[model samples]
Target: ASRILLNNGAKMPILGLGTWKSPPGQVTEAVKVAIDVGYRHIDCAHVYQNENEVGVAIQEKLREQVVKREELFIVSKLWCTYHEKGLVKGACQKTLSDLKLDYLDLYLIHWPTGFKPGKEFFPLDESGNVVPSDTNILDTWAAMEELVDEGLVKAIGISNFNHLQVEMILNKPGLKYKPAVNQIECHPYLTQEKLIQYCQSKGIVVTAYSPLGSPDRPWAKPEDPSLLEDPRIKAIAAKHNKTTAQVLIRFPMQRNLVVIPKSVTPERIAENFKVFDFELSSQDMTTLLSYNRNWRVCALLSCTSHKDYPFHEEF
Candidate 1:
């Protein structure tokens, strides 16, 4: 319900509707309902493979005058495969084409590591190992600034980058821009207190991705810990007449981090926005933050060996 004053001087809603796992046939309705239910921010990506449908819903709402193009803060990302200089614009345009938009409000580098270009998205080898590219993140970032230069997007950012990785850009010759936002995996379990403070001190904002634990993560194992079923989380929600998801979603917002929680269901979508009605007391805030266990749900273990992997740092 609130928006952040962007570094670029535009306003972006803090609580956004995330589209990561939203399937193709269902995403259209998900987006339409999102707009109707008072969501001003919509997060999408090239690799999600559902831009066509999300676009359909955005167009529908625009036609119905439910919202205007400029009023909505639409975002998307460039996948690991498109980090090459010449390929960057086209990669962004491909998403623009499918989303039926002339420009994006904000765009991001999807990850720190670059995947093999001019091949399949994942580009697996004969031995079933994932291929990697040597493109420097600073090089890819230069192309991103060119996007801001060309006015294809209002603001540009990065996702999954650690503090050390973010610091490497200061050496970029004539660095045209610092990112407006840095999206990361953060919830109570992965509270990331130090990282958030580190970024904020540098004037870069942190956006919490998978804020409610990403229960639908594809590679999740049964032995993994669950955030929703915790008794402490349940007790907090009960005290506030809220769902555990509400507590999880509010954890970041109360601390002033932008958060995106994904879901395609109407009931849950509406339930998520109910966070504005309550505040977690210092006791609850202390209680919730107590769950910090360095437990991450979206670790992307497959990319661990890549040279540019961001998580190897201590942040």
Candidate 2:
């Protein structure tokens, strides 16, 4: 199967179409194009502000008999502002409405970090820094469990959570549902070997976001590393007759990960899905794995002081 069966026994497409940076009118077409190009999973979120467009794509595909709703695994997130127990379901409901789906295949706590309960997405202060809230992640996780119980989401997981943070949830006194997935930034640059082992050993699946190295912005620092341009990856790609992006995406797939690579363009989207045909050699896999620098593109540096900030640990 191209899908991995979650700890909850639900399945997800191994490669997913991420909806983060795709632009306005184009994201609609991007979603439709991806579906036509054999993408059965579309990773979305309320914060992406493009869920409405993706919803239309799904509705169009469903209406036209291109694919059934049951065939597509839709994933969304609960943003930091809605970490409170009372707001978890509401935030999930908001995403469900925007995606035009009654149930999500997987709903993740967007980040372990939380901002004060408010309407502002980041809850900025005088210095334009994000103000942190005291809402414990356990509370947020407890609220997430209710989503599974009530049937709003098929399975629940977390994002940006480190090893110890995941343990806290796993060891919770009244833990009901296990975290089916822990979506994190995983690429050659940030090899999360230890964390992945920890999550998988406990029955949690690890979803790699930015498998091609992004959130890589236009204003990136002069010295920032580019996975796409890395000579070593290019060398490996040429050896296998694949693109560097394919090498990166396949790196995690070979490590038993489910990866999501974002693309609003048609050819790139299809190129991303073509990984199932190739296999990297043992030497090629080791070459990619050793390039780890703990370099993270989505460090969320502004929220470093938040008690739940996940990067401070050594994992």
Candidate 3:
């Protein structure tokens, strides 16, 4: 029943189900199951290309009267290609139409970088090079602010933006609405305390993605270090009679940040939603805080290494 109220006065559930990389066929069922299991928030993105399925489930839920439109805090993202001034509004509107919703509770600039249209996932060419575009992040952020005026979106924020990138967006002229949140890759290995504090200092809420250490990622090999099995997390989870993943989720919620953990299985999804039932002790919190090793997964270094990449030398 707990919720995090945005600066715009919109209330969102503290813990939500993340749908990044969720299979297209499974997302609809996953969403329905999540709502049935007590999730009131659903994080989504246009680039994910599964909004249609998600929309079907949401529409069905509404028609069934299982949950009302106002009770769900639905979140989506604006992709890099639409950062151009002319395409910004249309991009958000397309997402609105795709999701079958009148307004989004929160909409975010997916990345601080821009890419050309028609490029699916990676914006690179043959031989692995990043193709940069002229549309800057600040211009795109300015357009995002306009979404509030147009009444298409209730709140706006940024994701995958660095400290300097965020500062630049915040310093723009005629900025009526500041970013209400900054969603980023945060977990036990990538705690991002400094960045979280920075956003908090500015009154911008921080949303942590990959909160359960992203173990089940299909793109990642099985050999990837299992954060759920990490000795420190395991010890704490055992103490609380919970799984390490649950402990990981609780660690951030106790710090007053929003966390989105993805799961496709029924039991795991239901278990993950039970994060609110317990709290981490101060000593355990400090121990978890000390686990930050700067283990960034979505490192922009891949793009930064390209010849035409902008801000690489500066970042």
CA deviation > 4 Å runs, candidate 1: none
lDDT-best of 2 and 3: 2
Which residue pairs overlap in candidate 2's backbone? none
Q: What TM-score does each of the candidates earn?
A: 0.97, 0.98, 0.93
Tens digits of lDDT, candidate 1, 1-315 = 498887888888988999998989898999888899888898999899899999999999999999999899899999999999999999999999999998899999999889899658788778666689889899999999999888889999998888888887655778898888989999878888888998888878789998888889998879877888888999999999999999998889888889999999998988887788898898999888889988887666667878987877778
Could you say which candidate leads in lDDT?
2
Task: Summing lDDT over every window of 10 consecutive residues in candidate 3, give the lowest-scoring window.
Answer: 306-315
lDDT of predicted model 1: 0.88
Residue 155 of model 3: what lDDT? 95
Model 1: how far residue 123 lies from native, Å: 1.4
Residue 11 lDDT (model 3): 78
After superposition, which runs of candidate 3 have C-alpha atoms over 4 Å from their true positions? 119-121, 218-223, 306-315
140-207 per-residue lDDT for model 3 (tens digits): 87898899999999999999877777787789877788898899888877777777888888888989
Please give the lDDT score at residue 138 for candidate 2: 91
lDDT of 2 by residue, 113-208 (tens): 888887788887897678987788898889999898899999999998999999999988898988999999999999999999999888889999
